[PDB]
Enzyme design. Structure first.
Site, PDB file in Angstrom:
ATOM      1  N   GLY A  94     -12.277   3.429   3.706  1.00 27.97           N
ATOM      2  CA  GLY A  94     -12.977   4.716   3.767  1.00 27.97           C
ATOM      3  C   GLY A  94     -13.299   5.275   2.390  1.00 27.97           C
ATOM      4  N   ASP A 130       2.902  -2.247   2.238  1.00 22.65           N
ATOM      5  CA  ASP A 130       1.818  -2.100   1.245  1.00 22.65           C
ATOM      6  C   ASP A 130       2.342  -1.284   0.069  1.00 22.65           C
ATOM      7  OD1 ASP A 130      -0.707  -2.846   0.254  1.00 22.65           O
ATOM      8  OD2 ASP A 130      -1.827  -1.131   1.107  1.00 22.65           O
TER       9      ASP A 130
END
Ligand SMILES: CN1CCN(c2ccc3[nH]c(-c4c(N)c5c(F)cccc5[nH]c4=O)nc3c2)CC1
Length: 255
Positions: free
Chosen positions: A19, A121
């Site tokens: 995004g 992550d």
């Protein structure tokens, strides 16, 4: 229940590779935010993730603020991410600065691991900073041996952590010089990374990385067990990061 009356956008913070991330300020109350914005299949896949974050309410993990296109309002952390900090300052992090991040990460990991959740992550670009000097983490007998292994499973985080600590010492992670194709092989082939200049850091740092970066998730330790390591067991002040956030702000003021 339309948005835009609730929030008003007043900045951009970084088109990552997911995004874009903008800065939002509440229309009524005045509060800041980070708005992640996207627009059937993917949509229900994102709702699960959002509803997972509501659950993950803790000191060192970004607060979910709301969910209205697809808007996701998350807490503004005005220090930004540690990797951005490290370049704006153009240097690594001091060991005491690294001590405070390692410890706060361990409480975030140990929290998540009791909820039966993994991050997966963990890198410096997902460790954000507050002005107060605190972090936030962001966003059957015919079976073949290798099929068995890929069905302890949350020790992945603990590897990424130790690797994140090298990223923070050295600005760049180990194997930064090879392309993503060759990295995976190097990871799987090579011995656990150590620090480049062992002389530069304390014996506790070297040993923490020795035990954090065990290739065997059986013998590799939990966030819990690591909290009793000398490297982070004596850490009671966030001073060294309070210090580092200040410089970063100061360096950013320059023109
Ligand atoms: C270059 N100078 C230092 C870095 N600069 C900066 C400033 C504020 C920032 N806030 C966030 C931020 C997120 N990126 C974020 C996310 F990616 C996911 C979820 C919540 C988030 N919250 C944030 O608050 N990044 C910033 C970077 C720009 C100025």
């Amino acid at each position: 229940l339309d948005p835009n009356e609730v929030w008003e956008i007043v900045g951009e913070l970084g088109d990552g590779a997911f995004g874009k991330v903008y800065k939002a300020k509440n229309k009524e109350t005045g509060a800041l935010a980070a708005a992640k914005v996207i627009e059937e299949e993917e949509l229900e896949d994102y709702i699960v993730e959002i509803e997972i974050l509501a659950t993950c309410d803790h000191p060192y993990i970004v607060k979910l603020l709301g969910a209205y296109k697809l808007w996701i309002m998350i807490e503004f952390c005005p220090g930004g991410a540690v990797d951005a900090i490290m370049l704006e300052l153009d240097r690594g992090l001091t060991e005491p600065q690294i001590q405070v991040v390692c410890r706060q990460m361990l409480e975030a990991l140990n929290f998540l691991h009791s909820k039966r959740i993994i991050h997966r992550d963990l890198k410096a670009g997902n460790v954000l900073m507050t002005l107060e000097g605190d972090i936030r983490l962001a966003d059957p007998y015919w079976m073949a041996p290798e099929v068995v292994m890929c069905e302890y499973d949350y020790k992945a985080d603990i590897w990424s952590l130790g690797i994140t600590l090298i990223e923070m010492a050295q600005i760049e992670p180990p194997h930064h010089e090879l392309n993503p194709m060759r990295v995976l092989l190097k990871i799987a082939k090579s011995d656990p990374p150590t620090l480049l200049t062992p002389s530069k850091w304390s014996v506790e740092f070297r040993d923490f990385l020795k035990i954090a970066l065990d290739k065997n998730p059986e013998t590799r330790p939990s966030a819990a067990q690591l909290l009793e390591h000398p490297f982070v067991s004596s850490i009671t002040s966030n001073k060294a990061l309070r210090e580092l956030v200040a410089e970063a702000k100061a360096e950013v003021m320059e023109e």
